[PDB]
């Protein structure tokens, strides 16, 4: 009747102006806290950070003062580090390597997106333009009051120098990756030295060193393949643990180059579900320097026995690094089903020089002490899957050798991620490293002396995707981030790692916080917001008696950032299996109760993402507000398989992706229809990108009477065509889950898609190297065979995401027109 | 105006599917073998390729032509017993599938074959191997089908372009891995003759026509058997010769097109010369081999021109054609410069070729050795201000020395393709083949003794795309096809090459004929049809006294083939510049005068094609009849630039592609509006594929108030992305025609496209290796930048043309829906 609200129909030009009007920069992040060391001065700290003032991301600093009036709020000035410097390459065009890493990192912003910092010398090291640059501030060099030009580091290399890092033991040196091999150089003398020789004169050249391969980067959130030893030994020797990789047996596929006029593709090693991942191993590279800084010698070392024989079950190296004294290297290992993890200590003496000579090799093997061996200090096991959590803090071995104390984030134990203090017993069995042997199961398993829960409950410690802990050893406290208060807000917490009792929250409720702690534990920064309020960045001092450190009171010190949008509203309901799901609704603008409005169910719905939480959405999800301003109801549901709710909630997806997610979405939709008076269930569109697109198609397949149209972007339509890392973890290998692979692949159910045109819009970025355009291509193929209608939009200069603003606007205008006309 | 406007009934998608499904629910490549039995009842056996209607694929067949008749319908007899020539699920090798595209070959099975008349030996490609069978001559005529014999090989990969050695049928040749091979069919012995091949580090090949030669110059071979054997050496060895083209693609651009193995997610590399970019480096080489009495291949030799091809013929960019004289005294080549405005017919004496050696010293000796009188002879040179179309007619007569008499099809002389008899004088200047040689502007240009026009007038002899002449030397008559009667019909004519007087037509008017003439000139076949009648295939016997062979009467001997569709109507009109253009209309079925109907202007409009002529359109253009049955008027105009109207008609395109054609189309549309009163000019849609998609986009760009919607398929949107052969011929090099490349490139005029959605539907095959998907991908890129709506349909398992019926049906269903919903 007249109850049905009708969206105003605009011309295309009209829609373009509306979208253009709606859209007519990244808050400080990546901080370094530095104490001044000057009682006379008016500043206690200098805070260094990356940020973008109201053009490009750049290195910046603020001065933290010694006293504030406290009658008024103090706003800190963003001072430029560099004087009129452009870090973005000309026309924002990066090399294939640098552009692919921005993709893997989901980096949109231009300029300096990472940097290294050496505290003692005040040395900053970073990629800029298509080269390497550096500058010095603080420490022995002293604190500038105005910007200084960064100095380009000269190289006789060709191609980009990737993943640069300062030597922690000696800031005269630094490392980088050039043409799939490891290099080192001395900033002070300009001397360059290559340490690995896996690359030659690229189906022909399949070996690399120091490099994280595609799946490692896309599916394991590791972007480096090497790790500086934190100390030197005495000439003086320096060390680098590194992953050596061989992709020969890995499948090659071709994706189109951004240079469209060239009409060429790029080749990738793409391990599709069910076939070979690269062959990998951990190696060690040494090099000696004299007192003048000259690189005297270098050496390539390998495990005394093959890595494949020592660790037969290991499929991926998730993480690596060293103990703080440089005693032991360490590596986090994973099996192919991703159900068994191992933290392993590799003592350096375990590694011997590589040589072609079998005699020399046996001499080096005989020489290795019998008491040197791998130590498997930890092992996590599960029936679902092992999420890679990044927390692992080895304490120095003060209580002598033969034991190792560390903190560890474990989720498999109780089903949620919590902190544990662990003491593993290192007891050398004694080995004949000269004779080869095949180690069995639990061959290097350390007995666990003790294992204490530091945190517990129906909630999780944040330990993935940049989340970290801060451990103060004087006070025996561990600072961390979590959902203890609620799954919709991230908060900062402190708890004793000595006496695991009271967890104390340091962040204010109502808001979700992104925090950085000073290494001196005297102050932290919180970048936070709510659904109703734009984000701010405040500086908090921890004040109180030094005899009660757990109860330091965080006191607001200063602010670094502050602030036709209508915020959405968070709600919750329970499913017909009594599971609590959260949701979000954008109500139509100028709502008139009694009207039923057309509705857009905006969806993602896969693992590792939570859309519904209490933080500001107006930046990333402006289009959803735009839809609301035209008078659409917009509904977002976080169904089972979504994250921040523990393994068992996420685990509802196991081996049946596509099957569980829509029900929760349909439940949520029906709930919203009762609660809020304003949903017309006769006019409901489903729409998402990536996992969201896959689900938009499943929604139309399985629930055609509920969803009138689907707008599906960048979808995965054939699970056999997706990679190993992601697919096998949640769906098993295809040989072991034909039912799920088939039931979850939308391209194989195309008969179930509609006979009515205008109900399915497909969208996909032609350059997509993650969800290959093949997915859309194969779906149309099958749509054609089944005699089904479709509409299609291509983004020819876009990969998985749309990043060019004009393409984005076109995307939003198209979406508005499709809905206007056909919903 | 409400009642007047006819409204197409709007169907559901499934309804449209049933309509397309309901709607969709000949002999060629002949050999006339004379049967030499007086008592028998059959004068000849006629061998040919054909698809029986019951049969799934093309196959080698035969009919028996009887001695006397009393309406005879001849049986199609199977040559091969229950043989599948199509490989599994019609899946050819990349090499054979790309050659099928280049040849525009739709049908499955045996698409070509070689035949040696004396031995009665047939040689052809089948499965993914080579097959052969024997019939007639010394073998004898079979009465029942015979299983074909496979030819075993040590080679790996496909054996392409098989040809029987004319001088000795025991031998045959083929291309394996970009090199020329020969083999003795009787002994099964194989022998490789070139070594250009050993991916992108292997750019040399031999005996092979490269992409552009194939796609743009209608040559599918790069080797040519010498037709006569030789008998020179120490002790009784027999020498056989093959002329061939060596090619070096090094400096030619590489592009990647996706593989038909979609699930592989890979591409193929292609040497694709874009306009203005480098073509392969070329030369002509000679390969000889010697055989003993037992048919063993004793030796082989790689030979080459005593002087570089690039110094002897410095202006030559493309080898259009080549071959040998019938006595094997000279090899010949047709050459073309890069602008394709200068052609040369050149005779290459075999003695002009010396064995190839890396040794500097040996080459000098062999060069010195070459006789001083030996040289190339440029017997013909053709020049023009427009472009040289390549004409296949060149018939050298046997010599009876010091001159060469030949027939030539020439278009540049008068502006129309006509037959000429030419006598060129061969007089040797004398050259030191040892010294370096740099030639003058007319170094080997033979004087022309005489040059006679055998045909003349405002009409053309057919000399391209399979058209050819037949020359009977006893009677002095040349037989050919032409548009002399009218440009809408192909007819068979006979004129004397001895005495150029009366041209006699042998085909019946009212139809367009495709004819094959017997080598004995006693019998001929015509495959013909009209706009209103489906094709037929009749056998005609030439009769009359031998006193006046020019005046032999064709007499119907027998038929090989006989016979809601409503044919279209041909019409003609005159432009405001007083040019006569032909058109075609399909009237809406069950038309009610006074109604105004929505109209589809179906277009192509590019050179080398003519849509409007008097022949059956029902097979190829069924969809246009389906449109008419729904109530659309469908119009087709042959505007300036189209073919079979001579060079100057075609020449109006020159360096302004996209600029002239639409005017002729619009004139044509408005004309049809006045004559027939059933066209609603407020509802006109433009649609075509290939050149027609390019024009559909130009129609909407330049005439947005004339065309409400455009449906463009496989279009070229940026001329810079297109190849050298086609583009440079009609549009010059990009550095010499920046205005025209820019005005003719639809992707650069995207601002001019509409602001209203549902006015433009773009279609393109993902696997297109001719008009790369890039073109559409680039237009979408530009559309997005300009903020312009578009719809788009991809054919993922399809190159330039849609061949999977499942996809074809979907394409039509999509078209009807687009028209129904958005044409208003
Ligand atoms: N490899 C995955 C991917 O990009 N996918 C695309 C896609 C599209 C359709 C169906 C499934 C998939 C999986 C990504 C793994 C990391 C995850 N991040 C979110 C916040 C931090 C970690 C996002 C997904
Ligand atoms: N290479 C050309 C082609 O395929 N083109 C596609 C296309 C699309 C848009 C704009 C221009 C072009 C040119 C074809 C050359 C051979 C010719 N044949 C017709 C009958 C016998 C010869 C047809 C054209």
XYZ file of N, CA and C in Angstrom, chain A residues 345-466:
366
model
N 63.334 -24.003 19.606
C 64.594 -23.264 19.758
C 65.683 -23.957 18.961
N 66.392 -23.196 18.137
C 67.497 -23.727 17.351
C 68.761 -23.044 17.859
N 69.610 -23.795 18.584
C 70.872 -23.160 18.986
C 71.825 -22.968 17.753
N 72.528 -21.761 17.637
C 73.380 -21.495 16.425
C 74.417 -22.568 16.068
N 75.007 -23.169 17.094
C 75.955 -24.280 16.949
C 75.385 -25.487 16.175
N 74.061 -25.612 16.173
C 73.327 -26.562 15.328
C 73.509 -26.351 13.825
N 73.916 -25.139 13.428
C 74.114 -24.804 12.029
C 75.583 -24.898 11.675
N 75.876 -25.518 10.525
C 77.256 -25.688 10.014
C 77.423 -25.022 8.649
N 78.647 -24.587 8.305
C 78.877 -24.055 6.955
C 78.384 -24.979 5.844
N 77.748 -24.406 4.824
C 77.385 -25.151 3.615
C 78.643 -25.333 2.758
N 78.841 -26.557 2.262
C 79.933 -26.900 1.328
C 79.521 -28.027 0.380
N 80.060 -27.993 -0.832
C 79.818 -29.054 -1.820
C 80.594 -30.324 -1.454
N 81.755 -30.141 -0.811
C 82.626 -31.227 -0.334
C 81.992 -32.067 0.801
N 81.737 -33.353 0.541
C 81.170 -34.273 1.550
C 82.066 -34.509 2.777
N 83.384 -34.405 2.588
C 84.356 -34.593 3.674
C 84.285 -33.425 4.652
N 84.415 -32.206 4.121
C 84.312 -30.959 4.915
C 83.012 -30.898 5.722
N 81.908 -31.318 5.083
C 80.587 -31.352 5.716
C 80.588 -32.315 6.912
N 81.171 -33.503 6.721
C 81.288 -34.482 7.805
C 82.227 -34.019 8.921
N 83.250 -33.238 8.574
C 84.134 -32.640 9.587
C 83.369 -31.658 10.468
N 82.579 -30.798 9.836
C 81.740 -29.836 10.564
C 80.653 -30.504 11.416
N 80.093 -31.595 10.891
C 79.102 -32.430 11.593
C 79.635 -33.119 12.858
N 80.786 -33.786 12.723
C 81.530 -34.367 13.848
C 81.844 -33.329 14.930
N 82.187 -32.121 14.504
C 82.560 -31.042 15.432
C 81.425 -30.494 16.338
N 80.163 -30.625 15.914
C 79.015 -30.048 16.654
C 78.850 -30.790 17.985
N 78.813 -30.046 19.134
C 78.674 -30.796 20.370
C 77.458 -31.687 20.360
N 77.586 -32.811 21.048
C 76.531 -33.808 21.142
C 75.378 -33.258 21.984
N 75.691 -32.352 22.908
C 74.688 -31.742 23.776
C 73.840 -30.608 23.114
N 74.246 -30.136 21.932
C 73.471 -29.152 21.145
C 72.344 -29.840 20.385
N 71.143 -29.269 20.436
C 69.965 -29.875 19.796
C 68.750 -28.914 19.670
N 67.787 -29.249 18.800
C 66.535 -28.495 18.848
C 65.826 -28.675 20.186
N 65.170 -27.622 20.667
C 64.315 -27.701 21.868
C 62.912 -27.267 21.520
N 61.962 -28.192 21.586
C 60.562 -27.879 21.308
C 59.936 -27.528 22.643
N 59.978 -26.243 22.960
C 59.457 -25.731 24.223
C 57.924 -25.648 24.277
N 57.246 -25.747 23.127
C 55.781 -25.701 23.113
C 55.124 -26.406 21.912
N 53.893 -26.827 22.127
C 53.128 -27.525 21.126
C 51.639 -27.305 21.445
N 50.898 -26.736 20.496
C 49.442 -26.493 20.612
C 48.722 -27.388 19.605
N 47.654 -28.056 20.032
C 46.922 -28.992 19.173
C 45.399 -28.748 19.250
N 44.688 -29.014 18.160
C 43.245 -28.782 18.118
C 42.500 -29.583 17.028
N 41.189 -29.698 17.227
C 40.266 -30.380 16.300
C 39.681 -29.441 15.243
N 39.802 -28.133 15.472
C 39.283 -27.105 14.578
C 40.426 -26.632 13.655
N 41.185 -25.612 14.056
C 42.369 -25.137 13.323
C 43.193 -24.248 14.260
N 44.491 -24.132 13.982
C 45.410 -23.305 14.775
C 45.523 -21.923 14.135
N 44.952 -20.928 14.801
C 45.136 -19.565 14.413
C 46.537 -19.183 14.895
N 47.325 -18.572 14.025
C 48.663 -18.105 14.374
C 48.585 -16.834 15.250
N 48.860 -16.980 16.543
C 48.947 -15.834 17.462
C 50.410 -15.423 17.675
N 50.636 -14.118 17.714
C 51.976 -13.560 17.574
C 52.735 -13.430 18.877
N 52.023 -13.484 20.000
C 52.640 -13.292 21.312
C 53.547 -14.458 21.644
N 54.804 -14.148 21.942
C 55.767 -15.143 22.428
C 56.933 -14.377 22.988
N 57.037 -14.315 24.307
C 58.030 -13.497 24.961
C 58.975 -14.366 25.799
N 60.154 -14.716 25.241
C 61.142 -15.477 26.037
C 61.891 -14.562 27.029
N 61.854 -14.918 28.319
C 62.547 -14.142 29.378
C 64.003 -14.565 29.397
N 64.919 -13.673 29.842
C 66.311 -14.124 29.835
C 66.485 -15.268 30.822
N 67.451 -16.140 30.534
C 67.686 -17.345 31.342
C 68.522 -16.970 32.559
N 67.865 -16.317 33.521
C 68.487 -15.898 34.783
C 68.641 -17.076 35.722
N 67.643 -17.962 35.725
C 67.626 -19.144 36.617
C 68.502 -20.267 36.028
N 69.528 -19.874 35.262
C 70.475 -20.793 34.637
C 69.926 -21.414 33.373
N 70.744 -22.250 32.742
C 70.331 -22.989 31.541
C 69.537 -24.205 32.031
N 69.107 -25.070 31.120
C 68.279 -26.235 31.476
C 66.804 -25.873 31.697
N 66.454 -24.595 31.563
C 65.043 -24.187 31.654
C 64.825 -22.843 30.947
N 63.606 -22.650 30.456
C 63.223 -21.451 29.733
C 61.799 -21.036 30.133
N 61.682 -19.803 30.617
C 60.410 -19.203 30.976
C 59.961 -18.292 29.806
N 58.727 -18.462 29.350
C 58.134 -17.520 28.431
C 56.600 -17.342 28.586
N 56.122 -16.178 28.180
C 54.702 -15.933 28.055
C 54.262 -16.425 26.682
N 53.029 -16.900 26.598
C 52.512 -17.378 25.330
C 51.001 -17.243 25.260
N 50.524 -16.699 24.132
C 49.102 -16.600 23.822
C 48.689 -17.909 23.202
N 47.729 -18.565 23.846
C 47.236 -19.874 23.463
C 45.712 -19.754 23.394
N 45.138 -20.240 22.294
C 43.679 -20.286 22.101
C 43.108 -21.701 22.164
N 43.889 -22.678 21.726
C 43.432 -24.068 21.679
C 43.147 -24.698 23.047
N 43.759 -24.188 24.119
C 43.617 -24.810 25.452
C 42.190 -24.809 25.953
N 41.583 -23.629 26.016
C 40.195 -23.477 26.499
C 39.181 -23.000 25.455
N 39.655 -22.663 24.249
C 38.798 -22.157 23.164
C 38.799 -20.649 23.005
N 39.611 -19.967 23.799
C 39.776 -18.532 23.664
C 41.237 -18.209 23.884
N 41.686 -17.118 23.296
C 43.068 -16.676 23.379
C 43.359 -15.980 24.706
N 44.248 -16.593 25.482
C 44.681 -16.082 26.764
C 46.160 -16.280 26.919
N 46.701 -15.513 27.857
C 48.118 -15.488 28.189
C 48.416 -16.535 29.273
N 49.515 -17.247 29.055
C 50.020 -18.293 29.945
C 51.501 -18.019 30.185
N 51.990 -18.331 31.382
C 53.433 -18.285 31.676
C 53.861 -19.741 31.659
N 54.910 -20.048 30.915
C 55.348 -21.431 30.691
C 56.839 -21.565 31.000
N 57.200 -22.702 31.575
C 58.589 -23.014 31.879
C 58.822 -24.384 31.296
N 59.664 -24.445 30.263
C 60.005 -25.688 29.600
C 61.388 -26.123 30.032
N 61.549 -27.424 30.240
C 62.834 -28.000 30.660
C 63.699 -28.381 29.433
N 64.842 -27.713 29.299
C 65.837 -28.015 28.269
C 66.849 -29.028 28.829
N 66.730 -30.302 28.453
C 67.643 -31.348 28.939
C 68.206 -32.089 27.756
N 69.507 -31.905 27.509
C 70.153 -32.443 26.311
C 70.319 -33.961 26.355
N 69.594 -34.639 25.472
C 69.662 -36.083 25.357
C 71.025 -36.564 24.834
N 71.638 -35.790 23.938
C 72.949 -36.128 23.355
C 72.783 -36.837 22.015
N 73.374 -36.283 20.944
C 73.208 -36.840 19.588
C 74.492 -37.007 18.807
N 74.480 -38.004 17.922
C 75.551 -38.241 16.975
C 75.154 -37.503 15.711
N 75.502 -36.218 15.655
C 75.163 -35.383 14.494
C 75.921 -35.780 13.238
N 77.035 -36.489 13.405
C 77.772 -37.078 12.283
C 76.957 -38.139 11.525
N 76.180 -38.952 12.248
C 75.352 -40.011 11.630
C 73.930 -39.502 11.391
N 73.375 -39.682 10.163
C 71.989 -39.239 10.000
C 70.989 -40.172 10.681
N 69.884 -39.599 11.142
C 68.820 -40.363 11.780
C 67.477 -39.709 11.464
N 66.398 -40.480 11.579
C 65.053 -39.944 11.366
C 64.324 -39.783 12.698
N 64.308 -38.547 13.254
C 63.606 -38.323 14.504
C 62.137 -38.676 14.451
N 61.662 -39.339 15.500
C 60.252 -39.664 15.625
C 59.408 -38.518 16.123
N 58.244 -38.889 16.654
C 57.290 -37.930 17.211
C 57.743 -37.594 18.613
N 57.590 -36.323 18.976
C 57.984 -35.838 20.299
C 59.480 -36.102 20.560
N 60.283 -36.010 19.497
C 61.708 -36.292 19.573
C 62.454 -35.241 20.401
N 62.098 -33.974 20.221
C 62.754 -32.870 20.919
C 61.827 -32.220 21.943
N 60.707 -32.891 22.263
C 59.715 -32.392 23.239
C 60.347 -32.170 24.620
N 60.454 -30.904 25.000
C 60.826 -30.515 26.346
C 59.691 -30.854 27.318
N 60.020 -31.412 28.507
C 58.958 -31.453 29.505
C 58.624 -30.033 29.997
N 57.351 -29.810 30.302
C 56.856 -28.519 30.770
C 56.900 -28.578 32.295
N 57.697 -27.698 32.906
C 57.878 -27.687 34.362
C 56.617 -27.142 35.007
N 56.186 -25.976 34.535
C 54.890 -25.424 34.923
C 54.236 -24.652 33.788
N 52.947 -24.375 33.965
C 52.136 -23.642 32.979
C 50.989 -22.955 33.731
N 51.074 -21.636 33.873
C 50.121 -20.873 34.661
C 49.246 -20.039 33.743
N 47.921 -20.091 33.943
C 46.957 -19.169 33.288
C 47.066 -17.773 33.839
N 47.427 -16.780 33.012
C 47.445 -15.340 33.460
C 46.096 -14.592 33.268
N 45.282 -15.135 32.373
C 44.016 -14.571 32.008
C 43.155 -15.787 31.722
N 41.855 -15.641 31.956
C 40.893 -16.713 31.668
C 39.519 -16.087 31.459
N 38.571 -16.899 30.978
C 37.174 -16.465 30.777
C 36.667 -16.535 29.341
N 35.381 -16.194 29.189
C 34.664 -16.195 27.899
C 34.937 -14.913 27.048
N 36.192 -14.737 26.679
C 36.666 -13.524 26.044
C 38.118 -13.774 25.617
N 38.699 -12.858 24.842
C 40.029 -13.101 24.270
C 41.040 -11.969 24.348
N 42.288 -12.391 24.544
C 43.435 -11.522 24.423
C 43.720 -11.329 22.942
N 44.028 -10.091 22.578
C 44.340 -9.746 21.200
C 45.802 -10.015 20.932
N 46.063 -10.856 19.933
C 47.414 -11.329 19.635
C 47.727 -11.521 18.179
N 46.851 -11.062 17.267
C 47.021 -11.244 15.818
C 46.997 -9.889 15.156
N 47.416 -9.837 13.898
C 47.195 -8.668 13.009
C 47.646 -7.327 13.579
N 48.834 -7.359 14.173
C 49.438 -6.187 14.773
C 49.296 -6.073 16.278
